[PDB]
Design a protein around this ligand. Structure first.
Ligand SMILES: NS(=O)(=O)c1ccccc1OC(F)F
Length: 185
């Protein structure tokens, strides 16, 4: 792909984080802590899952960023509406305001309803995410495999400002402690 020139500097919004997450000083990395991180509760925090939003809001234009997923067993990545549900149980779907892909149990899937199997020959260590607001497109790229396309959501109905979306996943296995990291431009 040739989307690299739309690169944006994403930072994580601490106030939206699940209370077990640990965000680095530079707001560019996040991982699952082994306990509650001693923060007050608020209406923005994702309560049920290890999720956090980017601080940036997008309502027009083309945007691109990259995320490092090295040695993780489970994660979700993409964008979502600013007004997505924060509390309780929900599925990641465009109907609920999410445009995402994930790794889970050794398979990659797009967060359609129902979910779509992805075909990845080279397990990615870094993912590129491209949003074209006007066109209604969210695309995912395999940076480890020379930028090959993973998935395109088209005919998106954003219906609001978009925020970068992250889920570090649970660590029931002891094999999923590694962070998500926003990669430098
Ligand atoms: N398993 S846990 O108690 O450490 C936990 C941590 C963050 C969010 C949800 C959660 O548990 C359950 F709601 F899924």
């Amino acid at each position: 792909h040739h989307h690299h020139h739309h690169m944006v500097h994403i930072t994580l919004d601490r106030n939206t984080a699940n209370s077990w997450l640990i965000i680095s000083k530079d707001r560019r990395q996040v991982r699952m802590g082994d306990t509650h991180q001693n923060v007050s509760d608020n209406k923005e925090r994702f309560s049920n899952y290890p999720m956090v939003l980017g601080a940036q809001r997008f309502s027009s234009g083309k945007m691109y960023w990259e995320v490092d997923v090295t040695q993780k067993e489970a994660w979700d990545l993409g964008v979502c509406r600013d007004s997505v549900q924060r509390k309780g149980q929900f599925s990641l779907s465009p109907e609920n305001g999410f445009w995402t892909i994930w790794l889970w149990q050794d398979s990659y899937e797009a967060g359609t309803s129902p979910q779509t199997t992805l075909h990845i020959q080279v397990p990615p260590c870094q993912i590129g995410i491209f949003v074209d607001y006007e066109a209604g497109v969210v695309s995912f790229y395999n940076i480890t495999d020379h930028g090959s396309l993973i998935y395109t959501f088209s005919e998106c109905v954003f219906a609001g400002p978009l925020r970068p979306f992250f889920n570090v996943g649970f660590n029931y296995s002891g094999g999923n402690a590694a962070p998500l990291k926003l990669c430098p431009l």
